[PDB]
Amino acid sequence: RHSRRAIAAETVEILERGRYTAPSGRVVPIADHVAQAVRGTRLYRPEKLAVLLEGTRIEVTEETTLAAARRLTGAAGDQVACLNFASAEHPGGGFLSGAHAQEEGLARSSGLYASLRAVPQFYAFHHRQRDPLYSDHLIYSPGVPVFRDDAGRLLEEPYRVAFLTSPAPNRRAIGDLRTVEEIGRVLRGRAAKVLAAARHHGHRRLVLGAWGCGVFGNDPAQVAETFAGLLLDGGPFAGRFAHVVFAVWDTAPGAPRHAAFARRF
Numbered sequence: 413r414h415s416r417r418a419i420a421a422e423t424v425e426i427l428e429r430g431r432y433t434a435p436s437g438r439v440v441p442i443a444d445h446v447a448q449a450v451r452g453t454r455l456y457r458p459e460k461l462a463v464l465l466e467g468t469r470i471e472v473t474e475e476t477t478l479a480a481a482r483r484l485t486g487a488a489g490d491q492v493a494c495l496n497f498a499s500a501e502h503p504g505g506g507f508l509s510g511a512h513a514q515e516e517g518l519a520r521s522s523g524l525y526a527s528l529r530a531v532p533q534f535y536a537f538h539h540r541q542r543d544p545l546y547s548d549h550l551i552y553s554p555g556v557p558v559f560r561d562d563a564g565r566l567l568e569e570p571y572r573v574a575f576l577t578s579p580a581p582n583r584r585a586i587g588d589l590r591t592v593e594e595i596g597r598v599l600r601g602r603a604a605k606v607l608a609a610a611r612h613h614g615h616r617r618l619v620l621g622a623w624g625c626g627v628f629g630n631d632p633a634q635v636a637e638t639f640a641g642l643l644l645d646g647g648p649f650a651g652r653f654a655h656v657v658f659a660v661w662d663t664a665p666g667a668p669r670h671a672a673f674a675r676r677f
């Protein structure tokens with residue numbers, strides 16, 4: 413936790429100063445790309461995403477979100493979109509306190525916090541709503557520079573991805589006071605909107621994963637099935653993306669989140 417906290421603070425310094433020093437000693441400028449990502453950030457309300465919905469190579473890997481994004485970005489020039497397994501309440505989650513989950517890693521490693529912190533309306537909505545189902549609001553962050561690897565080392569050459577920030581329902585907080593089917597309906601509607609936003613912004617390659625299945629306590633079989641219903645068996649997004657990676661990095665014994673996705677896809 414202390415090392416993660418230090419890295420988070422360094423990233424905030426980097427985002428203020430507009431440059432960082434790579435391990436070779438190269439000084440890498442990022443201010444322009446960070447500013448572009450912030451200025452291009454958009455909040456989508458639930459009903460705007462619903463309007464989009466009126467209008468494939470599938471891999472399951474043990475990669476982190478960022479590792480999969482980096483791999484894809486090296487292989488072709490179209491910008492990849494990645495799902496941020498978002499906090500509804502804090503931009504970058506607990507990253508500055510050294511918390512360890514997917515969003516925090518994204519915030520430690522990229523310009524994502526600079527984008528998310530600029531959308532206070534998203535966070536205010538959820539704070540006032542006080543319901544752990546959260547909502548279908550989504551933040552779209554284009555061209556966010558990524559400048560660390562999985563170990564926290566700064567990159568000689570940063571790369572850019574789009575982020576899609578949408579919180580899964582907090583099933584852990586709900587317990588059994590919503591049914592399996594109610595949670596499934598919420599997951600399906602929201603995931604459909606995430607995919608619609610990605611496609612609307614021209615992203616043909618996605619990095620998805622076990623959204624909601626760690627800190628938020630969702631069932632990975634249900635989340636894998638949610639994506640499967642959208643992408644397979646003639647579902648609404650069947651054939652609409654070129655490449656979808658379920659990058660599932662699960663350090664728990666048995667890697668159960670990864671196993672559920674491997675089984676389904």
Ligand SMILES: Nc1ncnc2c1ncn2[C@@H]1O[C@H](COP(=O)(O)OP(=O)(O)OC[C@H]2O[C@H](O)[C@H](O)[C@@H]2O)[C@@H](O)[C@H]1O
Pocket residue numbers: 475476477478497498499500504505506511513514515516517580621622623624625626627628629630659660661662663669670
């Ligand atoms: N870097 C990663 N890359 C890919 N998969 C990962 C990674 N880290 C974890 N996983 C796997 O993917 C699963 C889900 O990762 P989780 O980060 O718990 O997402 P949530 O949507 O349930 O929790 C969101 C909250 O956690 C944050 O604090 C936020 O700010 C929110 O407050 C894990 O169980 C792992 O199997």
